[PDB]
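Deviation from plan, reported transparently: PDY complex.
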Amino acid sequence: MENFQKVEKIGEGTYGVVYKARNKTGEVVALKKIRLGVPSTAIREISLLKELNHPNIVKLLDVIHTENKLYLVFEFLHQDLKKFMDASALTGIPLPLIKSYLFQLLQGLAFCHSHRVLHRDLKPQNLLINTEGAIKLADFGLARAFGVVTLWYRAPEILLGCKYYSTAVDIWSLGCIFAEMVTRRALFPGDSEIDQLFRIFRTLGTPDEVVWPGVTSMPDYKPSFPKWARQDFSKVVPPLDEDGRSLLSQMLHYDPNKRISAKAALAHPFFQDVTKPVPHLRL
Ligand SMILES: CCOc1ccc(Nc2c(C)c(N[C@H]3CCCNC3)nc3ccnn23)cc1
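Because the crystal trials were delayed, the predicted structure below was used instead.
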């Protein structure tokens, strides 16, 4: 721990402060001080995460439990998708690069999901990019590990009070990010839980028992919810092509059981001509 020299503060998450740091191995790392001894379950869960290694998952290099505090040492990347989106706002991310990033994030999700590990908190600031065209998921497994946060990417079954949600929650979040790369605007930018739900309802239709069996018995479902009609995706994500719109529609299925899995999404015709472009990055 005295083994690291802070370089600068680079971020601030739900789980504490993040610094760029140098390991006195020579390596440059992202160091996360976990907000706080450490409960023993958090330890064994995080220890499990160190083994969950994939090219599209930010590598957990080390887990330092000392002085009764917890530090997570991560592989360092120089940019995130939020900043890249803000920088690309004038002409948009080119479609082939959108498709490459979506494809790679679905590979990362299919990996974690096959081990029954969920992210739960996907958002642009958690997706990190390098000069080689790679994109990686940061903070995977941390929500389960530890128990204004953005609601924009939160799945409707969470907002409706489901306690035992599934890997489908990460697919919803990724479809929301896909729509945002395409249109250069957040799809559902809610500033309260009801505003988030009602934005979803205004675009996708108020869900009912027809499209989502069991919806009306959910913990926070209210029969008094206004009933809005569903919009056409051609209005929601222009100028995305029909393969893209078709894939997005399956990622945004109301019923978590009908929503497409990461593994099935990888086979969708949208990915038939996928390539790996390199972005233009100013670091
Ligand atoms: C171009 C300046 O922007 C940057 C600069 C550095 C980063 N790097 C970074 C940042 C900012 C980061 N921040 C965390 C903050 C809390 C939520 N999850 C991500 N985590 C990691 C892990 C590996 N790299 N990294 C991201 C964006």
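The two ends are 28 Å apart (CA to CA). We consider this an acceptable substitute for the interim report.
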